[PDB]
């Protein structure tokens with residue numbers, strides 16, 4: 001169960017989520033599980049659903065222990081509800097270990113499961129503070145670390161497949177240096193953005209605006225989501241750089257597709273976006289540079305296949321900045337829980353062209369606090 005055998009253990013897309021194979025119960029029941037850095041429950045479909053290929057059958061597991069406790073999760077987009085228990089869990093292409101972990105058996109849901117996503121549950125990798133029903137429900141990663149000799153770190157290489165390396169950093173997954181940003185508070189993986197540039201032009205906003213009311217790293221969100229003020233400025237700058245072509249407002253609202261004849265996408269008309277992240281030392285930062293190949297999400301559809309069609313994968317948020325899968329796809333992302341920091345390095349799998357490459361670079365000096 002070495003890091004070598006963990007390489008390429010993920011499947012999926014930014015639009016429907018990346019997933020890892022896991023087993024629950026004794027004898028083991030195989031399930032595909034969404035890798036979610038934006039939540040903290042290990043929750044699995046445990047009853048039939050039209051979108052589910054398979055589900056967790058607790059009656060077949062002798063190791064299952066009922067916690068006699070309900071869990072009701074209504075959220076802005078939909079809902080999931082079920083009941084708590086613990087059982088034996090393993091990751092076949094992860095560490096060579098079996099742990100006893102909390103499991104939320106999902107018995108009812110609304111707009112949670114996705115048709116054709118190929119996953120049956122979610123692995124919430126964030127901290128206990130945001131676990132449901134409350135912070136006393138120990139998340140999976142915490143149990144994994146407590147019960148084994150697995151180091152308190154994991155890394156994700158999302159390839160627009162991919163890899164989740166548990167307990168370490170695999171040098172074959174990235175090039176150049178790893179740059180670290182502090183985890184501001186252990187709840188979501190909260191970070192601080194200190195500057196935003198669009199085609200080298202500073203948005204010139206007070207840096208607190210970029211983190212209103214928090215900024216997080218979330219593999220379970222598709223888009224780069226920005227606070228209203230930031231979002232409007234970003235769209236204004238992107239529209240200006242790309243003014244040689246005019247797209248419908250629906251496109252900019254991330255609702256409507258933009259299509260070009262297959263192979264003709266005019267990547268060069270779209271600017272680079274640089275997010276400057278707080279460094280590990282005062283008033284020092286590094287930047288992660290996103291290309292349009294990251295922020296223009298292809299929508300695979302046989303019916304539109306004479307063309308290449310895309311959704312604008314930047315959208316407005318009322319709950320802070322969300323550095324989603326489209327952002328993570330350019331990079332190798334190290335969730336260094338042990339040192340309370342997140343590392344970024346150029347991914348060996350990011351999509352680019354002969355003119356531009358996604359980058360992770362620094363240091364940058366700014367001679368105020370950027371957090372809320």
Ligand SMILES: COc1cccc(-c2cccc([C@@]3(c4ccncc4)N=C(N)N4CC(F)(F)CN=C43)c2)c1F
Pocket residue numbers: 013014015016017018034036037038039073075077112113114122218219220221222325
């Ligand atoms: C890119 O990854 C994804 C793409 C499409 C859907 C999901 C997905 C599906 C169900 C639930 C979630 C969930 C979620 C997980 C657990 N409980 C509720 C929601 N995971 C995350 N990170 N978010 C962000 C949100 F804005 F909150 C909306 N919902 C979520 C994500 C996904 F992770």
